[PDB]
């Protein structure tokens, strides 16, 4: 009939194959494609959506008390508030986010993240922060005068209760560290006598549209059930 011969790699089951397989139930009419709202076509549509960072990363902070950052009159005037190590692969404030949990399903990530901080105090409450980005390899700034020489922003709590901070191209891909975001308190926190002295910040990390993921591996998140 048709002369054939078996190549090497024949009769093997490859777990990443793509072959037309024989259907079990032919001529079964499926249920038709009724349009369902909010279809996902690409996993970057998840990662572009923002998500709260677990900023307050100290000990004895359990659950709801990690997302917010208490700033008050007793916040050491201008010492420091926090630091965000930009390690999606490793532990930090970014381990449990949408950019965190999806970029642990992928080995070599890339792209430009962006942060969005948000103040959550009373309307009269004013003050100034200085958010400071440190490039990879740059030293983590300890005081404000070292910090104000980085690529920073000086944020006031008036009409600006949200700051979109852009982080440039990192291409991260073993304790590895590819940057810092340290926020220093510029002025002392002014609250009126009627408002509470303690006010709070929350963050939002979101990847841009240039964020790239490749070489899908499995996640180390869940690891070890009844029924």
């Amino acid at each position: 009939g048709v002369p054939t011969y078996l190549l090497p790699g024949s009769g093997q089951f490859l777990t990443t194959d793509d072959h037309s397989s024989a259907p079990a139930l032919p001529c079964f009419n499926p249920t038709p494609e009724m349009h369902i709202p909010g279809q996902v076509r690409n996993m970057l549509e998840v990662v572009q959506v923002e998500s709260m960072m677990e900023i307050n990363n100290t000990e004895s902070a359990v659950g709801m008390e990690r997302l917010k950052v208490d700033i008050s009159a007793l916040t050491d005037v201008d010492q420091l508030l926090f630091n965000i190590p930009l390690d999606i692969q490793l532990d930090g404030p970014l381990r449990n986010t949408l950019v965190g949990n999806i970029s642990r399903y992928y080995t070599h990530w890339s792209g430009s993240l962006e942060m969005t901080f948000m103040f959550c105090g009373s309307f009269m409450a004013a003050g100034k922060l200085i958010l400071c980005y440190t490039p990879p390899g740059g030293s983590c700034p300890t005081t404000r005068e070292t910090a104000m020489l980085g690529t920073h922003i000086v944020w006031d709590f008036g009409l600006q209760s949200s700051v979109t901070l852009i982080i440039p191209w990192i291409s991260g891909s073993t304790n590895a560290n590819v940057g810092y975001v340290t926020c220093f308190m510029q002025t002392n926190l002014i609250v009126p006598s009627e408002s509470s002295d303690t006010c709070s910040l929350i963050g939002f990390i979101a990847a841009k549209d240039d964020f790239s993921l490749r070489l899908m591996r499995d996640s180390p998140d869940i690891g070890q059930l009844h029924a």
Binding site: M34, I36, P37, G38, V46, V49, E50, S51, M52, M53, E54, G63, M64, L67, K68, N96, T97, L98, N101, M118, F119, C120, G121, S122, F123, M124, A125, S161, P192, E194, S195, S196, D197, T198, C199, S200, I202, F204, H226, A227
Partner: protein, 216 residues
């Protein structure tokens, strides 16, 4: 002004309403179409310095009020979108944040047990339930990733209202109302309330209104 059917809210600063998942409620290509489209306003919930959150499952939260309480317990299938208005009156001197999120198919999970949640623990009715662990949304997920759902922020600094327009989120074209709940409106106080001499209530008003109702 938001006039639906017969009754309305006179809201003042109508914030940018979030069309959920980009869609908008519209009919399928019996229908009352006018009576059930009205703002069913729930109770004002006691929001304090130590509240964890509130969840209302839709449409279990409306199976006891008005025409929609009648048109569920006569019929067998419903198909209706939703418009949720959450307005939280507060002065300038209060502080705090809310995450007004509308979770579809929020299958809850009980704490420290492998027993399924019962009928008493899921279907609460109009009164709504309190979160037991709001950091994990009471199903093992994370609140930090919960902005993937339709959400808006009530930051009492910036605004004091949140309008979500929820469409028909279901695989089935028409579903039984009493034995299934699609959306779970969840109001989580991320940054809690705080003020010194007046640490008491800042009430939260939830105004659910069904849109584009169908019944068979």
């Amino acid at each position: 002004q938001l006039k639906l059917g017969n009754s309305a809210i006179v809201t003042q600063e109508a914030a940018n309403y979030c069309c959920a998942y980009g869609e908008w409620p519209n009919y399928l290509p019996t229908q009352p179409e006018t009576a059930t489209d009205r703002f069913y306003t729930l109770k004002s919930v006691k929001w304090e310095t130590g509240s964890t959150g509130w969840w209302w499952k839709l449409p279990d939260a409306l199976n006891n009020i008005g025409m929609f309480g009648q048109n569920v317990q006569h019929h067998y299938l419903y198909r209706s979108g939703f418009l949720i208005h959450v307005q939280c009156n507060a002065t300038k001197f209060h502080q705090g944040a809310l995450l007004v999120v509308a979770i579809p198919e929020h299958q809850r999970g009980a704490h420290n047990t492998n027993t399924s949640p019962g009928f008493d623990d899921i279907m609460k009715g109009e009164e709504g339930g309190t979160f037991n662990h709001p950091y994990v949304l009471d199903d093992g997920t994370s609140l930090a990733c919960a902005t993937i759902f339709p959400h808006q922020w009530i930051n009492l600094r910036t605004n004091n209202s949140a309008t979500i327009v929820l469409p028909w989120m279901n695989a089935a074209p028409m579903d039984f109302p009493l034995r299934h709940n699609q959306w779970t409106l969840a109001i989580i106080p991320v940054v809690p309330l705080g003020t010194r001499t007046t640490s008491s209530m800042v009430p939260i008003t939830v105004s659910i209104a069904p849109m584009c109702c169908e019944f068979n």
